Amino acid sequence: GWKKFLWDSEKKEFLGRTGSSWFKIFLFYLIFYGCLAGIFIGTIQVLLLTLSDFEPKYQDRVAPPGLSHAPYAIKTEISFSISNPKSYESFVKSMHKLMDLYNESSQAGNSPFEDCSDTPADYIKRGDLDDSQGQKKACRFSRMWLKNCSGLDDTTYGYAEGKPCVVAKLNRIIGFYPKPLKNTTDLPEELQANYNQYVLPLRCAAKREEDREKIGSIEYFGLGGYAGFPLQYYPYYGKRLQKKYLQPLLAIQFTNLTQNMELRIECKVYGENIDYSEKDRFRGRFEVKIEVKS
Amino acid sequence: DLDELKKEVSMDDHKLSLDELHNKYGTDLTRGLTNARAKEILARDGPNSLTPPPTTPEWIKFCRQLFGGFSILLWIGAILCFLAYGIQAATEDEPANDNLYLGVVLSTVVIVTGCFSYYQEAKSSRIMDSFKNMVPQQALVIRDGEKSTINAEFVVAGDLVEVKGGDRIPADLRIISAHGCKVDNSSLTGESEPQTRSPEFSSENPLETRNIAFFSTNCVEGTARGVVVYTGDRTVMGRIATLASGLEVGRTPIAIEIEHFIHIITGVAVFLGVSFFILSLILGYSWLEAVIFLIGIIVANVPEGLLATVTVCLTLTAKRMARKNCLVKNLEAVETLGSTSTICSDKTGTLTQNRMTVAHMWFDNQIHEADTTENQSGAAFDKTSATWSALSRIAALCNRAVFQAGQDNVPILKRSVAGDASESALLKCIELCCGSVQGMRDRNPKIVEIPFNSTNKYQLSIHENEKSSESRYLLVMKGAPERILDRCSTILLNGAEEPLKEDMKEAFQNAYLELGGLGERVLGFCHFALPEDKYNEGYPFDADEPNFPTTDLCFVGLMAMIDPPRAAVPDAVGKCRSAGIKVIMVTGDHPITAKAIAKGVGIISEGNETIEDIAARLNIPIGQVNPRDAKACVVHGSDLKDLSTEVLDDILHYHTEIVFARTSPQQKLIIVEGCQRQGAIVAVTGDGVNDSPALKKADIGVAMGISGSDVSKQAADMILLDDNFASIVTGVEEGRLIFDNLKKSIAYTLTSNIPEITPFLVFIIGNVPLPLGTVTILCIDLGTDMVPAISLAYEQAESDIMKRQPRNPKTDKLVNERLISMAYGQIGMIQALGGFFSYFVILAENGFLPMDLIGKRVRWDDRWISDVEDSFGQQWTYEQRKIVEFTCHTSFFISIVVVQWADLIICKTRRNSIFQQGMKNKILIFGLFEETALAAFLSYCPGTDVALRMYPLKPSWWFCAFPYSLIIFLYDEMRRFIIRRSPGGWVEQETYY
Ligand SMILES: *[C@@H]1O[C@H](CO)[C@@H](O[C@@H]2O[C@H](CO)[C@@H](O[C@@H]3O[C@H](CO[C@H]4O[C@H](CO)[C@@H](O)[C@H](O)[C@@H]4O)[C@@H](O)[C@H](O[C@H]4O[C@H](CO)[C@@H](O)[C@H](O)[C@@H]4O[C@@H]4O[C@H](CO)[C@@H](O)[C@H](O)[C@H]4NC(C)=O)[C@@H]3O)[C@H](O)[C@H]2NC(C)=O)[C@H](O)[C@H]1NC(C)=O
Ligand SMILES: *[C@@H]1O[C@H](CO[C@@H]2O[C@@H](C)[C@@H](O)[C@@H](O)[C@@H]2O)[C@@H](O[C@@H]2O[C@H](CO)[C@@H](O[C@@H]3O[C@H](CO[C@H]4O[C@H](CO)[C@@H](O)[C@H](O)[C@@H]4O)[C@@H](O)[C@H](O[C@H]4O[C@H](CO)[C@@H](O)[C@H](O)[C@@H]4O)[C@@H]3O)[C@H](O)[C@H]2NC(C)=O)[C@H](O)[C@H]1NC(C)=O
Ligand SMILES: *[C@@H]1O[C@H](CO[C@@H]2O[C@@H](C)[C@@H](O)[C@@H](O)[C@@H]2O)[C@@H](O[C@@H]2O[C@H](CO)[C@@H](O[C@@H]3O[C@H](CO)[C@@H](O)[C@H](O[C@H]4O[C@H](CO)[C@@H](O)[C@H](O)[C@@H]4O)[C@@H]3O)[C@H](O)[C@H]2NC(C)=O)[C@H](O)[C@H]1NC(C)=O
Ligand SMILES: Nc1ncnc2c1ncn2[C@@H]1O[C@H](COP(=O)(O)OP(=O)(O)OP(=O)(O)O)[C@@H](O)[C@H]1O
Ligand SMILES: *[C@@H]1O[C@H](CO)[C@@H](O[C@@H]2O[C@H](CO)[C@@H](O)[C@H](O)[C@H]2NC(C)=O)[C@H](O)[C@H]1NC(C)=O
Ligand SMILES: CC(C)CCC[C@@H](C)[C@H]1CC[C@H]2[C@@H]3CC=C4C[C@@H](O)CC[C@]4(C)[C@H]3CC[C@]12C
Ligand SMILES: CC(C)CCC[C@@H](C)[C@H]1CC[C@H]2[C@@H]3CC=C4C[C@@H](O)CC[C@]4(C)[C@H]3CC[C@]12C
Ligand SMILES: CC(C)CCC[C@@H](C)[C@H]1CC[C@H]2[C@@H]3CC=C4C[C@@H](O)CC[C@]4(C)[C@H]3CC[C@]12C
Ligand SMILES: [K+]
């Protein structure tokens, strides 16, 4: 059994067949699998044909834009010691990776960057989503706009003395026009002051009513000094039609933060085409657990 | 249970006296024991019943069913689920409870499968316990001087026990007084020899002496008394039963087949598991990811729904058999019939109709024919000789049957007669041409009668003589013509008497061979006038000693009877010869008749010849011809009584058409044990207890149902309700039919395993998002595929099954490599490709092109990366991409169903084409419709994203698997074509299951 079914010397069989059986079966499987592969490849080439290069056919799974930030938190928590330097390195490294793309050296010349209004403005349409006109032009976004969180003055960005920053960003969507709430009698409390129509407001607060007192002064930095995103950086024409495109950013300094205590801070954007979800905690808003233990 | 003390030869205290034994047991020879003493001993020694030995307790076998192959794998699955939950609960906060639910569910599946299988075996056990249908019995013990019939279990050592011809010995006794008592020690001596039990001692060996009765035997005739020396597990039959019962029964063929594939399945499961686990840690995978892998792979490989499908399939075919007159006691006997190649049947009541009418009669050296027609429209037989009158008196007197009360209206032939068919046929013929038998019987009072004996082979009785001038006694007896011929010396010719010279003896042999050649059963009738001088009118001839002259009788004449054959009998014999089943006519009928019935039924094919036939055709002695030139042969019972084992082996090894006549159903067992020895499955057909040791050791025991006794039916494996022989053929056909369907269903279920295994494999080799989750798998093997696999059983035959030879167990199997090459090698591959196609399509339409999917897994699964760039530059959060992956799982499952359509259609037939067989199976059509409705329901029903994680699909996706399905259909269609045109070629020895 054990030995025979492995190699016999009378019928010159290996594993059960001779060289002509093993050969017939191997050849059959080779031809069969070859045809299978060729058919799958053809059906994939026709797939490469059926779609357009300048626009995703379905854009419903990304209708309400998200709200991400610069630091990379494992569980949406920012905990670091003001003494041990090897504690906030993972944060600064990320922050730096994000801001390293807004370097002025990258943004230079007429092509493909264009100087835009230093003060929030309205939308700008560079035509349709076609290849007629060459690569569209995107507005320039300078680093310095973010005042105390830019890594140009205090590389660490704040984490060095108990005053961390948080660079918020709106998820890039093709053909998405941000629309802010109007001045009518119905509007949140916060939003009343500084109603620049052209700015999408971002405002952070405390998850629980208690934590309010323990959170100090939320100082936002942005384009024009407002706490929002200028409508002029929209819409986004997609990578193919707008490579070298920069999305606005908003810096948030959590000055006067109580020491040695977990603080739950929820940031939220307001607007018409913006809707939150009880399942996705990153749709329009975001949560951060800061704890500057020193 | 000391075996060595049980292996030793039995010892005893037989060589003693009547005084020395009562003292040993404290009893009275004329008064027995006292009730108080009897109960004191009943409590001291225990009951007279087989003490429950290693028996299976209720919880023991239930817990056994909980641990068996698929349950161990599912158990390790539940364990893994709880391990991953523990890890999550100790490593992260807010741990979703999905894994704990999946584990509790797996454990529930294991517990329920058990419950179902146990319930089925319990159902069979109950219907099995419901067979003793007439009335139980007890023993006759004498206590305090009174006779009482008490429960046999209540018999103790020392009391007095009385037995009577027909009752079973309740325990081992020491005979104290007997009256012509005879016992049948068939269980210890192996012979149906009627040993007489005498109070005196006769042999040093306890098994040979007569002063000892043994449990497991019966008192054939007479009455006796005796003291109880052994009771319970201590009796002879107690040592036989308790130590021989321990012997295991065995594992039926279908069980061995289910084991062979569990072995193969486990082989590929461990090969993929241990290997990918080592690979997972060779690539840097953490523990909480590798555990999820391991689980997914184990579930993917295990067909969680197969065994239950098999159990159902078999239950359906058992219901079909219960509807076609063939009832099967043990579920697996359904298949044993198909694998049969040797049958030991009987001739009366199977091949024949058992209705019966007298046909010919011998008297005055002349054959006479009687009218055997319903309305009695024919020729009389010359009722003018005295011989006929004497014959009428013999038959009308030596017969115990009588017309059933209240038949004064029906005709003489259609009335009901309570009794055997021979006595009934004789009674009808006498009542037909001899007037009222009731007056003929009251005209001669029967004094003493000795009924037919299976050993004596004769019925005798001494009645008074109606002769007013001759106040003597008449003796009549009937029986086998040879035995009766050996018991006479005169012949009643035309009335007068004459000697039995060889001239009439040869005329009797030729007449006997004439009636036998006619396929009729002949009987001999003789009588004698007892001399009133040696046996006066007052002397009583008690049936104990030789009170009547056995020999020197006056033979009057032979009497035949036409039991006819059945409709399908010639056809059934032809079907058996066409298949290759060696039929053996075993009948208590005569060889002289057997050769005629054999030529009339087929056993002796038109052309074959026996050694005597050749010697007769060449008018030469029989010792000159060579036994190789004779295809058939008629073996006599006496020559069977004097035959060795090897001789029987050669008899069955060198002859294709054997017929056993003048056979006592004991010898039967010997022939059965000789048929199994050569290496062939054996079936048997029985009616009584002599067949019990033959039906138990035969691969399949077919017992009759109407004429059969409780013992014979309760000890057999298959019961017949119409007592016909065509039912045996029907059982074999259904056993084959349910086999080819199991093959088809297995290939079906297996084929879908590849599209479930490949996504995981690509997930590890190519690093692409998970294509098919585990819940979707369980929703495929436990959902949409169950109904179609169940429907595959209702498939009709393709060619003629009752024509091919029985399958070889050592070479042909149920799951070979050809099936693996088809399901795992070709069809499954196409199904997997179709699933991947739909997958890539769903991802390409949402923004993730195939070039950017390779290498994204690390970040596609990262729960903290809310910015995943796609092929167009869009940023996707974690939950959004997860929603897309789930929609890809839903479409993959639907693609599986789409390809399963063509797989169920190509699996419907194994060789024939679809345009030939036809889609007449309504169950299969219903299966397809339901299979589609279930997938649509699981996807479109609201709230399915909270329970099963399945999102709705867009109407353009549902058409991504259609080309693959049609391709599968065309490929298998051309496959099942070269096989038909090229028999024995490559496509047949490579893909013909
Ligand atoms: C946001 O980010 C900024 C950095 O971008 C950060 O800090 C600011 O940093 C700059 C430069 O570091 C400050 O500008 C100047 O700081 C001078 C300090 O240097 C003196 O001291 C050091 C050592 O102590 C010496 O080596 C050096 O030679 C200097 O002597 C300061 O001198 C400058 O001038 C101020 O003070 C003189 C009087 O000394 C006054 O005449 C000026 O008008 C000027 O303003 C006055 O400052 C004092 C300081 O408290 C104030 O009390 C007084 O009211 C001011 N008078 C006014 C307004 O009329 C000059 O300040 C800069 O000040 C830093 N801070 C600010 C708020 O501008 C911030 O800390 C970051 N903020 C947050 C919230 O994170
Ligand atoms: C975008 O801008 C980044 C910053 O640009 C600087 O500031 C702007 C406003 C301009 O003035 C520009 O000209 C400046 O360079 C730019 O990153 C910078 O790249 C340089 C070159 O590698 C880095 O200089 C090196 O510094 C290290 C030590 O760095 C310490 O500080 C940083 C934080 O700033 C920590 O991350 C480190 O761990 C250290 O703690 C020096 O050791 C190193 O030595 C090398 O040069 C010396 C001569 O000076 C040689 O003798 C040695 O052999 C070495 O060859 C450099 O001096 C600079 O640190 C870095 N800045 C930051 C903040 O990381 C970035 O590359 C730009 N990206 C693009 C895409 O344009
Ligand atoms: C967005 O909306 C706010 C509020 O608009 C007001 O409420 C809306 C719901 C709706 O009903 C509007 O019709 C309504 O105006 C705009 O800001 C408001 O602007 C007015 C005008 O400056 C302010 O009213 C002022 O109130 C002062 C005390 O609180 C009073 O002293 C001021 O005096 C001025 O006006 C008087 C005449 O009434 C004149 O005599 C004085 O000399 C002086 O000019 C004046 O009455 C409101 O307080 C403002 N509201 C807030 C919350 O600050 C806002 O400008 C608008 N933004 C845009 C871009 O349109
Ligand atoms: N009730 C009966 N009374 C008298 N003679 C009988 C009776 N039944 C059968 N015989 C005769 O005795 C013979 C022995 O009967 P037995 O039952 O052994 O076999 P059988 O009836 O021929 O059937 P089978 O083919 O099943 O062996 C019969 O062939 C018949 O000649
Ligand atoms: C920042 O928070 C501190 C408290 O941590 C505030 O300062 C306190 O003010 C109270 C009076 O209301 C004094 O009793 C405490 O002694 C102060 N503590 C310290 C450390 O200064 C301070 O006002 C807050 N500043 C801002 C801008 O929010
Ligand atoms: C009937 C069956 C077996 C035929 C299958 C034919 C297969 C092998 C054919 C069909 C379509 C073919 C591919 C279609 C598209 C391209 C892209 C082109 O820039 C180079 C050739 C290439 C890469 C082809 C290679 C071979 C291919 C996959
Ligand atoms: C992921 C990919 C690359 C794996 C491809 C594995 C293929 C080539 C494997 C899977 C199953 C295999 C076949 C399965 C069954 C049999 C029958 C046996 O009697 C001989 C080997 C033979 C004929 C195998 C040949 C190789 C085979 C077709
Ligand atoms: C006879 C054989 C070779 C024909 C096979 C035809 C193949 C190439 C056809 C059949 C079904 C087709 C696909 C079915 C579904 C979709 C989704 C839709 O939103 C775009 C077209 C797309 C992606 C099709 C591309 C081409 C396709 C795969
Ligand atoms: K499976």
Ligand SMILES: [K+]
């Ligand atoms: K049996």
Ligand SMILES: [K+]
């Ligand atoms: K399956």
